[PDB]
Amino acid sequence: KETKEVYEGEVTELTPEDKTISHVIVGLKSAKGTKTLRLDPTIYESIQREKVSIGDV
Amino acid sequence: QSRSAKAGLTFPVGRVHRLLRRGNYAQRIGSGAPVYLTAVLEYLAAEILELAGNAARDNKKTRIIPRHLQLAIRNDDELNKLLGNVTIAQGGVLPNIHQNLLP
Amino acid sequence: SRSAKAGLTFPVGRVHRLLRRGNYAQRIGSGAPVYLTAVLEYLAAEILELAGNAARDNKKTRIIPRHLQLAIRNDDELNKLLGNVTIAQGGVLPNIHQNLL
Amino acid sequence: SKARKETYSSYIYKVLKQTHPDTGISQKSMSILNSFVNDIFERIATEASKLAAYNKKSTISAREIQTAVRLILPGELAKHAVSEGTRAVTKYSSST
Amino acid sequence: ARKETYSSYIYKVLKQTHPDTGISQKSMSILNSFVNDIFERIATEASKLAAYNKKSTISAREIQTAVRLILPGELAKHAVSEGTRAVTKYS
Amino acid sequence: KPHRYKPGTVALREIRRFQKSTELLIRKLPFQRLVREIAQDFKTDLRFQSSAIGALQESVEAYLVSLFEDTNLAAIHAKRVTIQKKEIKLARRLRGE
Amino acid sequence: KPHRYKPGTVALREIRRFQKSTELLIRKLPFQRLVREIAQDFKTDLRFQSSAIGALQESVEAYLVSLFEDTNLAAIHAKRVTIQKKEIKLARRLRGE
Amino acid sequence: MKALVEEIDKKTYNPDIYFTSLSRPVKRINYSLADLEARLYT
Amino acid sequence: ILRDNIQGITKPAIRRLARRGGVKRISGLIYEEVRAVLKSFLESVIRDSVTYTEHAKRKTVTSLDVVYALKRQGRTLYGFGG
Amino acid sequence: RDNIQGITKPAIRRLARRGGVKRISGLIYEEVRAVLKSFLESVIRDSVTYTEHAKRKTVTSLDVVYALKRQGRTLYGFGG
Amino acid sequence: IEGEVVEIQIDRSITGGHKQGKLTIKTTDMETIYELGNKMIDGLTKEKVLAGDVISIDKASGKITKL
Which amino acid does the sequence have at I51?
T
Deposited resolution, Å:
3.8
Domains identified in chain K, total number:
1
Strand partners, D24: B63
3-state secondary structure of B27: coil
Nearest C-alpha in F relative to G67: F94
G touches which chains (3+ CB pairs under 8 A)? C, F, J
Strand partners, B49: none
Query: What is the side-by-side strand order in the sheet with A24-26?
Result: A14-16, A24-26, A36-39, H5-8
H20, containing H or E segment: strand H18-21
3-state secondary structure of K4: strand
- How many interchain CB pairs under 8 A, E with I? 13
CA distance G36 to chain C (A): 23
Distance CA I3, CA G23 (A): 55
User: B52 near D29, Cβ under 8 Å?
Assistant: yes
Give the domain range for residue E10: 1-91
Report the CATH number at residue K32: 2.40.50.360
Q: How many CB atoms lie within 10 A of CB I1?
A: 8
B→F contacts (Cβ < 8 Å), by residue, are 66-67, 70, 87, 89-98, 100-101, 103
Instruction: Please report residues of D whose CB lies closer than 8 A to that of J49.
Output: 67, 70-71
Strand partners, H21: K7
| K2: phi then psi, degrees, rounded to nearest 5 | -160, 165
Domains and CATH numbers, chain G: 1-97 (1.10.20.10)
Residue D88 C-alpha from the chain's centroid: 13
Distance CA G71, CA G84 (A): 9
Kindly tell me the burial class for residue F33, based on how many C-beta atoms sit within 10 Å of its own C-beta (0-12, 13-18, 19 or more): middle
* Mutation target vs A (from H2, H4, H11; most A CBs, 10 A cutoff): H4
Instruction: Please report residues of F whose CB lies closer than 8 A to that of B84.
Output: none
How far lies G42's CA from each of G36, G45, J48, J53, in Å?
Answer: 9, 10, 9, 16
CA dihedral G43, G46, G52, G53 (to 10 degrees): 90
Instruction: Please report residues of H whose CB lies closer than 8 A to that of C43.
Output: none
Domains identified in chain D, total number:
1
Report the CATH number at residue D28: 1.10.20.10
CA distance D24 to chain I (A): 18
Distance CA C41, CA B14 (A): 45
Domains and CATH numbers, chain I: 1-81 (1.10.20.10)
CA distance I49 to chain D (A): 19
Residue K5 C-alpha from the chain's centroid: 8
Which amino acid does the sequence have at F92?
R
| B22: phi then psi, degrees, rounded to nearest 5 | -95, 5
Distance CA E6, CA E29 (A): 10
This entry's atomic model was obtained through cryo-EM
Chains G and E in direct contact, meaning 3 or more beta-carbon pairs closer than 8 angstroms: no
3-state secondary structure of D41: helix
Instruction: Please report residues of D whose CB lies closer than 8 A to that of I79.
Output: 28, 31-32, 35
**Which region holds residue B93: left if phi is over 0, alpha if psi is between -120 and 50, else beta?**
beta
Give the domain range for residue K43: 1-67
Distance CA I41, CA I37 (A): 6
Across the interface, do C92 and G76 touch by the CB < 8 Å criterion? no
Pairing of strands B63-64, D24-25: parallel
Distance CA C53, CA C71 (A): 8
CA dihedral J76, G60, G93, I11 (to 10 degrees): -30
Cβ-nearest to I51 among E61, E62, E69:
E69
For residue C20, what is the DSSP state?
A: H
Contact of H27 with chain E, judged by CB distance below 8 Å, is answered with no
How far lies J19's CA from each of B100, G15, J25, in Å?
Answer: 31, 8, 15
Distance CA E69, CA F84 (A): 35
